[PDB]
């Protein structure tokens, strides 16, 4: 019969997620800009290690966003497991809830108002760019970042075998960050739709 409270709760939760995912989007785009500079094979090992540090700062920001809590201190990207931070700080692994938070808002409509951290930070777009060798696309944002950061702190001057190895990891990160950004943008499209549905009452 009356969905007033349900719709206010879903508007609030969806607005919060859009607000945090907007920050995730900006941080992913900043890391992509770093990775473009890292594709320059005339960088010295000191320049490369400076880019690594910049990328660590961005990774740390994304980890703080992935472990975002709401007003009441409950984690927003953990599905129903809202009492513990869903991401492991060191590895970026997800161990929050596997089922998204849903809310019925009309006699017929139920919305996915809380996406899991797996859906946001350990998923890539349907439209993913493939690995050139046919191996699996990396799905975990933090892995993409950490593997780049490690390859940028590995000096490569005068050593072609290492130089190619480090440049292959940077290329792979460039592909992942596309794949991850596109996933977040598709989720944001879905939230934009939910807020249109909700505001039409
Ligand atoms: Na898409
Ligand atoms: Zn969704």
């Amino acid at each position: 019969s009356q969905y007033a409270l349900a719709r206010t709760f879903a508007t609030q939760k969806v607005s919060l997620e859009e607000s945090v995912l907007s920050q995730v989007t900006t941080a992913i785009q900043t890391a992509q800009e770093k990775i473009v500079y890292a594709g320059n094979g005339t960088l010295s090992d000191d320049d490369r290690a400076s880019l690594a540090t910049d990328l660590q700062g961005i990774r740390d920001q994304l980890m703080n966003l992935a472990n975002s809590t709401d007003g009441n201190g409950r984690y927003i990207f953990a599905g129903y497991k809202t009492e513990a931070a869903p991401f492991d700080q060191a590895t970026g692994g997800y161990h929050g809830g596997e089922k998204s938070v849903t809310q019925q808002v009309d006699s017929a409509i139920t919305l996915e108002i809380g996406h899991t951290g797996a859906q946001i930070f350990n998923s890539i777009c349907e439209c993913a760019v493939p690995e050139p060798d046919g191996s699996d696309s990396e799905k975990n944002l933090f892995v993409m970042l950490d593997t780049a950061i490690a390859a940028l702190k590995t000096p490569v001057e005068g050593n072609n075998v290492e130089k190619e190895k480090a440049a292959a990891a940077i290329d792979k990160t460039n592909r992942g960050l596309k794949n991850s950004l596109h996933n977040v943008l598709e989720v944001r499209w879905e939230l934009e739709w939910f807020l249109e549905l909700l505001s039409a009452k």
Side-chain angles (χ1 to χ4, degrees), residues 1-12 14-98 100-163 165-191 193-200:
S1 300
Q2 193 66 282
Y3 291 98
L5 188 51
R7 291 192 287 99
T8 296
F9 175 67
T11 301
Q12 190 178 310
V14 172
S15 298
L16 177 61
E17 268 212 346
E18 159 61 9
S19 176
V20 176
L21 289 188
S22 193
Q23 299 173 272
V24 169
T25 299
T26 298
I28 287 174
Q29 289 165 327
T30 308
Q32 293 173 294
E33 281 158 19
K34 300 292 133 106
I35 283 285
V36 168
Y37 287 93
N40 172 8
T42 68
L43 292 170
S44 67
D45 291 332
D46 283 349
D47 289 348
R48 283 171 74 263
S50 314
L51 278 176
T53 296
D54 295 333
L55 274 173
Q56 185 70 58
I58 297 160
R59 193 272 201 200
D60 299 344
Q61 295 175 242
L62 279 155
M63 180 55 65
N64 285 327
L65 290 171
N67 286 332
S68 284
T69 55
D70 60 18
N72 285 249
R74 287 308 186 69
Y75 294 89
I76 80 166
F77 294 124
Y80 291 95
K81 295 184 60 193
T82 65
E83 310 216 21
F87 292 84
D88 177 56
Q89 156 73 46
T91 63
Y94 181 65
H95 55 71
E98 280 299 324
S100 58
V101 178
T102 67
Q103 173 68 51
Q104 188 177 330
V105 293
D106 209 346
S107 62
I109 310 188
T110 292
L111 307 179
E112 189 172 31
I113 65 160
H115 282 87
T116 71
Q119 285 173 307
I120 303 294
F121 300 93
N122 192 221
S123 288
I124 49 172
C125 183
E126 50 202 32
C127 66
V129 308
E131 293 295 299
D133 59 359
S135 58
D136 280 357
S137 284
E138 175 57 55
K139 286 182 269 185
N140 182 288
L141 175 59
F142 299 100
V143 176
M144 295 171 193
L145 288 172
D146 287 350
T147 48
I149 289 159
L152 289 161
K153 291 179 172 188
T154 300
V156 302
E157 270 158 29
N159 184 343
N160 279 356
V161 163
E162 284 300 287
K163 191 187 187 215
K165 187 179 169 203
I170 294 298
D171 287 333
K172 183 179 187 173
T173 297
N174 181 260
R175 282 184 302 276
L177 288 182
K178 262 163 199 78
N179 288 345
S180 168
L181 173 74
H182 294 158
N183 181 240
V184 179
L185 290 183
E186 284 189 308
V187 170
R188 282 178 75 202
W189 296 338
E190 188 186 63
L191 305 179
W193 169 237
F194 288 171
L195 290 171
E196 293 174 34
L197 272 171
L198 283 166
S199 103

